[PDB]
């Protein structure tokens, strides 16, 4: 009577991995204040364990987890009573839980954008991106997409790194930034051509990924295995990525 797991699978090396993956949605106003932010997360598992192991995963700060959806292998009663995720896992890859992070704390905002944008047949577009509450972890995979208003015809910008395109039919500017390095912040600056004859500056939509960080602060305490007596490798990795992250200008 464990429906999600057959007996007698044998691996040559017994390993269990968990990946805590958080997506940050935020709207930041033109002064740098958070208008809105929320964090959603998943814990994904990759379980390559022989036999019938029974696992208990616990956290340092389980009060962060709100609105949790559980994989059916989880014994809900032991979460409710001890805040331990106790389960005999399916084999292979599966999503253990999904959650929303509690409102009790503000959301950490791991990047900032300095902007000087003014929109005559000629405007100025200057932005620089940098690390903010990122715990010094590398910010990579950064892209910045901007839906320019109809008045913008074309642009001549200089990226300090990466590359950009501007589509004069869809009016989208897309800057493939790459990663932030310490010595030299990425910036994109130059002039914009306007159709001579503009209320708010355009929003900046940012994608990014940050290894070795769960922006909620979620941290695993222990992973204990019962019912088998071998000593498996057990590890956890954390990553934060942008969901819908927007800076207004």
């Amino acid at each position: 009577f464990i429906p999600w797991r057959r007996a007698g699978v044998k691996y040559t090396n017994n390993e269990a991995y968990f990946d805590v993956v958080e997506e940050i949605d935020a709207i930041i106003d033109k002064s740098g204040s958070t208008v809105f932010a929320e964090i959603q997360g998943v814990i994904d598992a990759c379980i390559k364990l022989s036999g019938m192991p029974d696992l208990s995963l616990s956290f340092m700060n389980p009060r962060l987890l709100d609105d949790v959806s559980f994989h059916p292998c989880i014994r809900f009663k032991r979460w409710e009573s001890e805040r331990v995720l106790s389960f005999i896992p399916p084999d292979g890859n599966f999503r253990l839980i999904s959650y929303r992070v509690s409102s009790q704390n503000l959301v950490a905002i791991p990047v900032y954008v300095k902007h000087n944008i003014s929109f005559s047949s000629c405007g100025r577009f200057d932005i620089t991106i940098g690390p903010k509450q990122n715990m010094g972890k590398t910010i990579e995979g950064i892209t910045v997409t901007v839906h320019m208003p109809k008045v913008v015809l074309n642009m001549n910008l200089t990226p300090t790194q990466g590359s950009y395109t501007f589509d004069p039919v869809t009016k989208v500017l897309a800057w493939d930034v790459g990663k932030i390095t310490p010595q030299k912040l990425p910036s994109l600056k130059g002039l914009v051509n306007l159709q001579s004859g503009p209320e708010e500056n355009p929003n900046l939509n940012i994608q990014f990924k940050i290894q070795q960080l769960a922006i909620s602060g979620l941290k695993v305490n222990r992973l204990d295995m019962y019912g088998e007596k071998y000593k498996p490798f057990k590890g956890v990795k954390y990553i934060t990525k942008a969901g819908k992250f927007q800076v207004r200008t």
């Binding site: 991995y17 695993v220 222990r222 956890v236």
Partner: peptide
């Protein structure tokens, strides 16, 4: 890459 438990 993974933190060992």
């Amino acid at each position: 890459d993974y933190q060992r438990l």
